[PDB]
Design a protein around this motif. Sequence first.
Motif, PDB file in Angstrom:
ATOM      1  N   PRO A 125      30.571  33.636 -36.152  1.00  0.00           N
ATOM      2  CA  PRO A 125      29.336  32.848 -36.082  1.00  0.00           C
ATOM      3  C   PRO A 125      29.634  31.451 -35.577  1.00  0.00           C
ATOM      4  N   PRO A 126      30.712  30.842 -36.073  1.00  0.00           N
ATOM      5  CA  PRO A 126      31.217  29.598 -35.482  1.00  0.00           C
ATOM      6  C   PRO A 126      32.680  29.418 -35.835  1.00  0.00           C
ATOM      7  N   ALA A 127      32.900  28.837 -37.000  1.00  0.00           N
ATOM      8  CA  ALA A 127      34.213  28.630 -37.598  1.00  0.00           C
ATOM      9  C   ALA A 127      33.973  28.368 -39.080  1.00  0.00           C
ATOM     10  N   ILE A 128      35.055  28.239 -39.847  1.00  0.00           N
ATOM     11  CA  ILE A 128      34.907  27.862 -41.247  1.00  0.00           C
ATOM     12  C   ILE A 128      34.482  26.407 -41.398  1.00  0.00           C
ATOM     13  N   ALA A 129      34.675  25.586 -40.363  1.00  0.00           N
ATOM     14  CA  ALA A 129      34.223  24.201 -40.420  1.00  0.00           C
ATOM     15  C   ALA A 129      32.703  24.115 -40.422  1.00  0.00           C
ATOM     16  N   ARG A 131      23.621  23.103 -33.388  1.00  0.00           N
ATOM     17  CA  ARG A 131      24.306  24.160 -32.659  1.00  0.00           C
ATOM     18  C   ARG A 131      25.688  24.365 -33.261  1.00  0.00           C
ATOM     19  N   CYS A 132      26.000  25.611 -33.609  1.00  0.00           N
ATOM     20  CA  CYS A 132      27.277  25.963 -34.215  1.00  0.00           C
ATOM     21  C   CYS A 132      27.888  27.112 -33.428  1.00  0.00           C
ATOM     22  N   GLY A 133      29.139  26.952 -33.030  1.00  0.00           N
ATOM     23  CA  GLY A 133      29.850  27.976 -32.298  1.00  0.00           C
ATOM     24  C   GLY A 133      30.107  27.574 -30.853  1.00  0.00           C
TER      25      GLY A 133
END
Lengths: 94, 901
Positions: free
Chosen positions: B621-625, B629-631
């Motif tokens: 989906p993106p990252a653990i951070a 907008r994500c990813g």
Amino acid sequence: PSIHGDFSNDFRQPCVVFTGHPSLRFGDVVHFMELWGKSSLNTVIFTEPDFSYLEALAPYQPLAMKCIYCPIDTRLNFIQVSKLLKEVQPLHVV
Amino acid sequence: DANSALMELDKGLRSGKLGEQCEAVVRFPRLFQKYPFPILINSAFLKLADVFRVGNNFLRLCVLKVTQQSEKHLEKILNVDEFVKRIFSVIHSNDPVARAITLRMLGSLASIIPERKNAHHSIRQSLDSHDNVEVEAAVFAAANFSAQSKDFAVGICNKISEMIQGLATPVDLKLKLIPILQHMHHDAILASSARQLLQQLVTSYPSTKMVIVSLHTFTLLAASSLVDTPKQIQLLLQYLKNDPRKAVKRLAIQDLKLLANKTPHTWSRENIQALCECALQTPYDSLKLGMLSVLSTLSGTIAIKHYFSIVSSPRSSDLVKLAQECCYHNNRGIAAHGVRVLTNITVSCQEKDLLALEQDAVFGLESLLVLCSQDDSPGAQATLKIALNCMVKLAKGRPHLSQSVVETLLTQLHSAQDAARILMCHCLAAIAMQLPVLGDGMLGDLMELYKVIGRSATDKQQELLVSLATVIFVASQKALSVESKAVIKQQLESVSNGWTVYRIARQASRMGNHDMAKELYQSLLTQVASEHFYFWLNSLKEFSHAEQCLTGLQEENYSSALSCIAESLKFYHKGIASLTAASTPLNPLSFQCEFVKLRIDLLQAFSQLICTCNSLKTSPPPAIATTQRCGRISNQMKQSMEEFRSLASRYGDLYQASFDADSATLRNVELQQQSCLLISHAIEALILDPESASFQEYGSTGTAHADSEYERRMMSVYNHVLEEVESLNRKYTPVSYMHTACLCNAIIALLKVPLSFQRYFFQKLQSTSIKLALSPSPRNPAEPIAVQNNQQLALKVEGVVQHGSKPGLFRKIQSVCLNVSSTLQSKIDNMTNEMEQRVEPHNDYFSTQFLLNFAILGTHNITVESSVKDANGIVWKTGPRTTIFVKSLEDPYSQQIRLQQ
């Protein structure tokens, strides 16, 4: 009479030029205050009182034109004003 | 090597022999055509002048011939006064033939000297002289001055009035002097006086000769002075009706033809009634053809709408019944004119109580067709042209007749000769091109007709196969069967020219049947006897291969999408390598390479987009951070914005830089650019800021012109993608998978509708180029023009336009936008002097004055760009892109002053 004519085909660099109205807002003085007002090689010589020196250069700043405030006044100053008043002493002073 | 030709030919001019001087004089027009710049033009014209001044009266005729031929270069002469004085110094001679030649030269020079008074005095003095050649030359020069000057026009009005009705100067001279009255339209009262004099002349000299000359003069006066043209149309109706002579009637026909072509809005209702009524009770047939030809040309314009205007039953109107008995007439040409009139009534205004004529109209066409099919004569061929044009227009205006139209045409496609199969195949091609639903209704029938052509004649055979397979490609709106490919293939294996198969292959590449294009391009590849033609055919083969790979797609299958896209890219890249190898200095194929390159870039934008849609299923989906907008997918689709918007800009740049293509090629480029905008909007409406869209396509999505089937399928795909975008607007999460599926379905929908290599890919009809000879000093190569760095550089750019053929076929140059810029080549970079000027050419010349300010220290780079503005208004970015070099020197006194300061 004007730049419009005999001055065009007789002009000689370098020169001493005496220009129009000393208020630096109308005349031929505005044309020579432009054009030549780009180098520090030249200078403008303000010689006439009752017009503020720094205020005349105010539309022309920023500017590299050399400027010397050299005002020549012939009107009597306060010492001879005192001499005049102790010479012909009135009843009233306005 | 520009003035060297001038010194060579003028070395020829300083001979003492008449022959060498005449040879140089008649060689001047080629030199005029080769360099058209006014320095050479002015110099050579002054040399022609002082050769004209001293001459043995046969050189004078040659210089007169050169001046007559090179009329369009006359406005480029600079020193006009010396030229005209040198010419005019021969009027005061005593040889009458020399004087007549010099007045003819003045008449040729009329454009550049309209208001020279001594010329007018010489014309008036020699006009009433007694030597016949002087008189005839004076009438010529009076006609040529009277078209431009006004005081000359009024004085010569009085003079020619006197000498026409002076009862001397016999009838041949009167016939010569009436066109002086023709050129006499300058002022209102002048025109009225000329009109009264012409009416008096035509009622005073009632001959065959003078009436014809005076009536042509009178109608040129009417068509020049648009103040009482209806009065002359009226007078022509009495002359056509009440006059027993025949040649006068024929001039009345050609006269009404010219007037209906020029000013048809002035034709009143009773004028058309009079023309029709005079067309009824004529006993002759050539006169009948002439009047109904005039009515046929009148039927193609807005005169019919004025005729059928509300405030009588139009069935009882004279025009429609006259059209009926001349549509059912024995002669072929009068039938063609009548069926044109009936077709034009049908296509025009839609009152109810005309609709029955529709039926009559369509039957008329087939009746005329079965008269003109089996004749094989050029008159019958022209009748075929006229009938088939009427068939196209009739099917175009009223589509509900159109189906009946096409089936009747197929009947006469069974039984006619080899010259009638062509142009009927062309009519079917046009009708099945814009209106496609009927094309399939032929299908197989053409098959058996094509089979008959297996055993036909040989003389007109190749063009006939070309026409039949072209209408096969047009009619196959969906696809072609394998058996259809087999029968076409085996027939042209049976007999073919080799160029016929090339035409069939390029027709298939135009329509979208790229598999038969593959096979015929293989056939061409084994063939052919040159380098770059071989490479060109190999490139076309590779393009057809990639396009078949693009036809092999399946909806809702992204795996096949990636596979077939990769195959299409590799075949296009073999093709673009072949195109690059095929490029020649003589024919620098630029449209083809850019079109193919941007097609490759479009398919790679599609490939990156489809695998980017796959990335959501191929990344987190993106990252653990990240936990608006994500990813990495957001950055990737922002890159998709950059690529697709740049690609749309590059399509626009290809559109603007052509200017020599037709409407169809330009519209196809518009289709590709609209596809790029479609995908860009679709992505920036789904994932990248849904918030500020708020539009939902508030424009029209229907009622299109649909000039081609490819256009229609493109527009259907566009509307479907926009419907999917409106529906999926602001319901779902910004990343989503309906969004990625929407992009996937959009890419599949764009790649399903194949391609159309248009006309400009293969043949170029119009060729326009600009010269722009820069003259500050023109330099040489690396040598720069020296400037003194206290004055500007007067650039003085001058140009001329070169037309390949038919001057302007599709678009016409109205004004030309010259742009200039500088660049500091020492290493903004001197953007301070970007300048723009608009030019309106006189005949072909461009003359502007450019001042360029080089101020700092260095070598500067002047670039000059052209930009054609057309009649409609679209700017076109052609031009030679001329660059020139300048070096900036300094004055040593100024250098010492700057060092001291």
